[PDB]
């Protein structure tokens, strides 16, 4: 089993407010950007993949039904000398 983490690439990074100058606003700046860092889908954990490759064990399929669907050899007598030996033998008198 191969284990791989996949990064959420289709996820957009959070958006942080730019930085003020007055150290009086930094209080709100930190409190604002903080709310963004807490909703960061870019951050772990990441969804993972479990690669499987079970090929079985080698069971044999033996119950597949067949595709299967006259009697006299008298036709030999009219197949000429080539089959005389077989005419007297199978079909004929």
């Amino acid at each position: 089993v191969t284990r791989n983490d996949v990064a959420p690439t289709l996820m957009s990074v959070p958006q942080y407010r730019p930085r003020p100058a007055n150290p009086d606003e930094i209080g709100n700046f930190i409190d604002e950007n903080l709310k963004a860092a807490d909703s960061d889908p870019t951050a772990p954990p990441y969804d993972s993949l479990l690669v499987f490759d079970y090929e079985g064990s080698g069971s044999e399929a033996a119950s597949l039904s067949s595709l299967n669907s006259d009697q006299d050899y008298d036709y030999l007598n009219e197949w000429g000398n080539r089959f005389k030996k077989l005419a007297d033998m199978y079909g004929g008198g």
Binding site: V13, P14, Q15, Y16, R17, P18, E32, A36
Partner: peptide, 8 residues
């Protein structure tokens, strides 16, 4: 493009 300021 990630700055949180629509005007900007």
């Amino acid at each position: 493009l990630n700055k949180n300021n629509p005007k900007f």
